[PDB]
Structure 1
Amino acid sequence: APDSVDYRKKGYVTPVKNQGQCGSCWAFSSVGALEGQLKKKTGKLLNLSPQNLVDCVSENDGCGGGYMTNAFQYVQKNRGIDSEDAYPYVGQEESCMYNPTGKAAKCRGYREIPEGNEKALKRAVARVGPVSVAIDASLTSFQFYSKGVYYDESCNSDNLNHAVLAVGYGIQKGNKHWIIKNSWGENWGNKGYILMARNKNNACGIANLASFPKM
């Protein structure tokens, strides 16, 4: 095989979810990194709580938006995060009600990849596991995706607006790609996932806002 890795096979990825009518795409992306590690450093994968981050991370906007690094700082400074079953996802802002009894994971910090360095991202993905990324998902060609390696020249690396999780990488039919997991339910794209162009000058700004937590 060539240089390629798919973590879904491995077991580091949790089933696809839907954010709904809440811009909590960031809470979903941080939770995914958190799970990748929890598997890697435990052996058992478990569903972590996006709702928990949505309500308690005051440094962010709730369903209004938020960064992922800001999500990690909270898990640390709080010392634990809930599991889904413990803190259900209602897709809406409400009171932060963290149940320490159901604390399912924790981290001790994080690390951003060099702004724009695709190779630095690829290494992180291969040596760390799923990384949290932020791309330009405004283009309709992105939204109506069903198959193939997406690439749109009019995509803007300066319009970081949608946060997702890079699950792996590899080639297709002479096409390099970043295996991306979205949070719009398993009805969008290829069962929730989309293959984005890899090595095409950092398309849609894939490497402009990456990070992963340390556990």
Structure 2
Amino acid sequence: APDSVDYRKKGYVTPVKNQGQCGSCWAFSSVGALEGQLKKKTGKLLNLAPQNLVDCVSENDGCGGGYMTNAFQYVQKNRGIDSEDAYPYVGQEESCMYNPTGKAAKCRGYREIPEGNEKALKRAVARVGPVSVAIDASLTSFQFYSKGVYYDESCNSDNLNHAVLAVGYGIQKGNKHWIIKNSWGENWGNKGYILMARNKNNACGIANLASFPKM
């Protein structure tokens, strides 16, 4: 692997979105990983529809939370996900309005990174593209993150409560990090991004629930 990778610079990452009040982070995370694979396989970068996932992934819980794996499985079994333009995000759950004419990406299932294995996660990010990850984002320090490599001693690697997107990794002043796209708008964090400690004993559970769609 290279010592640093940043998909944002490669045109694999769409702009930062805002989930509003809805606990749909799993849907934004899933969509970001799908968007990365769509770019890698077809050369097109387009916004895909997290609202399609919130409304239609029937065993996830809409604005109450969900697994990215179930979202990828839905897209696979449904043979498609809509573009954002065809199924816009409204920040509340609605009945499923999936429309095949708005289909913008497909998926052949997904792969999970071995639990807790940050080296495998690094490999996946390097070889595959942006990877969906779940972290503990419940702390005050996370809400108020501004700059630097995020590290809070109280982060709980079993309290996976927020899904985000690993779009790269690198090192800042000697501190290894993951480059994480969040979905809380540009006014949170560093224009919507956070650098999270890497190789620091799986800080915040970064590598506990990582997955990527196959395309």
Task: Quickly name the TM-score band, shorter chain normalised.
Answer: over 0.9
- The alignment's TM-score, normalised by the length of structure 1, stands at 0.99
User: Is the contact between residue 82 and residue 100 of structure 1 (CA under 8 Å) also seen in structure 2?
Assistant: yes
* Count of aligned positions: 215
C-alpha distance in structure 1 between counterparts of 2:168 and 2:33, whole Å = 12
User: Is the contact between residue 108 and residue 214 of structure 1 (CA under 8 Å) also seen in structure 2?
Assistant: yes
Aligned identity (percent) is: 100
Q: C-alpha deviations, 1:55-109, integer Å up to 9, x for none?
A: 0100100111100000000000100000001001111111101110010000001
User: Is the contact between residue 2 and residue 170 of structure 1 (CA under 8 Å) also seen in structure 2?
Assistant: no
* Deviation (angstroms), 1:153: 1.0
C-alpha distance in structure 2 between counterparts of 1:94 and 1:39, whole Å = 28
Q: C-alpha deviations, 1:166-187, integer Å up to 9, x for none?
A: 0100100010000000000011
C-alpha distance in structure 2 between counterparts of 1:131 and 1:2, whole Å = 17
User: Is the contact between residue 2 and residue 126 of structure 2 (CA under 8 Å) also seen in structure 1?
Assistant: no
C-alpha distance in structure 2 between counterparts of 1:32 and 1:156, whole Å = 24
C-alpha distance in structure 1 between counterparts of 2:159 and 2:102, whole Å = 37
Partner of 1:163: 163
C-alpha distance in structure 2 between counterparts of 1:2 and 1:33, whole Å = 20
Q: C-alpha deviations, 1:107-158, integer Å up to 9, x for none?
A: 0010000000000000000000000000000111111111000101111001
C-alpha distance in structure 1 between counterparts of 2:90 and 2:144, whole Å = 26
C-alpha distance in structure 2 between counterparts of 1:7 and 1:124, whole Å = 13
C-alpha distance in structure 2 between counterparts of 1:181 and 1:49, whole Å = 16
C-alpha distance in structure 1 between counterparts of 2:120 and 2:194, whole Å = 21
C-alpha distance in structure 1 between counterparts of 2:134 and 2:104, whole Å = 25
Q: Secondary structure at the match of 1:122?
A: helix
Where does structure 1 lack aligned partners over 5 or more consecutive residues?
none
* Deviation (angstroms), 1:2: 5.9
* Deviation (angstroms), 1:34: 0.2
Q: Secondary structure at the match of 1:73?
A: helix
User: Is the contact between residue 175 and residue 197 of structure 1 (CA under 8 Å) also seen in structure 2?
Assistant: yes
Where does structure 2 lack aligned partners over 5 or more consecutive residues?
none
Structural RMSD (CA): 1.0
